[PDB]
Amino acid sequence: KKKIEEFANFFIENKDVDLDELADKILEIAEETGTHIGDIYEQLVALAPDEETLRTLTLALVRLLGRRKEPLDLDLVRLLVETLVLDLGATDLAVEVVKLAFSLAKKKEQLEKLLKAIDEVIEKARKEKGMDAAAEKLREVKEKYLLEHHH
């Protein structure tokens, strides 16, 4: 928790740091304390004081996820997809995360939880008024993966 708070204090003083340099900081805490990156992100979301902090932190997490420096964390993926779609209006980035998760989910158990995660975000998105377009985009990429698997 001490390193968690120190990172947040660093960000509020420098809000315009590079995402790559930011993502390195998250990875440093994850490897030093043996904590999964998803747990760090979940704690950091609760510590975000405004939308800008939540947005920049999520973007850094997405960049870190693309580095594949840790095994596929589906709980992190679900939180990233939920935040990007329902909180940041970044459904396009959520599609990238879902596509990245699809390419990394080699086991059936990992796959099954990823489809359930995609379905859950779709149901939540359709509960909001102006998120029908975002929900359709998530459905299409899930449908595209399932169709191409049998293709």
* Residues 122 and 151 both lie in one domain: yes
Quote the domain boundaries for residue 77: 72-151
Decide: residue 76, CB within 10 A, 0-12 exposed, 13-18 middle, 19+ buried.
buried
Residue 49 makes CB contacts below 8 A (sequence gap 6+) with 12
- Rounded Cα distance, 28 and 95, in Å: 27
* Residues 95 and 149 both lie in one domain: yes
* Residues 62 and 109 both lie in one domain: no
* Residues 44 and 80 both lie in one domain: no
Count of domains observed in the chain: 2
Residue that finishes a domain, picked among 70, 87, 103: 70
Specified resolution (Å)? 2.2
- Rounded Cα distance, 7 and 4, in Å: 5
- Rounded Cα distance, 142 and 146, in Å: 6
Breaks (C-N over 2.5 A) in the chain follow: none
Q: Are 43 and 6 in contact (CB under 8 A)?
A: no
